[PDB]
């Protein structure tokens, strides 16, 4: 029911009415609160200025060129051995293993786990990754 752009709650009225200097007090508390928040902004944006400084140049000096490697059907002995060591470091994460080998999709890696399970004691290799 109050006019637009006027703010008048029972709570706020009572808090200004309750004492002879309650008005001037409540307004001082907010003035102190405002100074306290404005000093904290200056602090944290001087902290953030220092961190932005300690990233001067980004990670462009440490960026690796893009690999154009095309997926392949046949497993070389090289690829089989890269895979067994990838299972040892990266566990069950199939995407990472595919990335390491370079020319084997996530499907083929998922296949490899079943086909060679027997011959590359993959159960033992996974148990070895879990122990770490």
């Amino acid at each position: 029911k109050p006019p637009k752009g006027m703010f008048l709650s029972q709570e706020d009225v009572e808090a200004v009415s309750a004492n002879a200097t309650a008005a001037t007090t409540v307004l001082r508390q907010l003035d102190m609160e405002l100074v306290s928040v404005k000093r904290q902004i200056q602090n944290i944006k001087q902290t953030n200025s220092a961190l932005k400084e300690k990233l001067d140049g980004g990670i462009e000096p440490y960026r690796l060129p893009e690999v154009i490697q095309k997926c392949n059907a046949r497993w070389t002995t090289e690829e089989q051995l890269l895979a067994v060591q990838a299972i040892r470091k990266y566990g069950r994460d199939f995407q990472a293993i595919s990335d390491v080998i370079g020319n084997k999709s996530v499907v083929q890696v998922k296949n490899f786990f079943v086909n060679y399970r027997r011959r590359f004691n993959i159960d033992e290799v996974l148990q070895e990754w879990e122990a770490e």
Binding site: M6, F7, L8, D12, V13, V16, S17, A23, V26, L27, L30, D31, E33, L34, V37, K38, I41
Partner: peptide, 19 residues
Amino acid sequence: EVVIQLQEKHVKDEQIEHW
């Protein structure tokens, strides 16, 4: 006086919530 004080309070309250 009381209505003006609550309009001054809301101005400060508004600044606070923004900062």
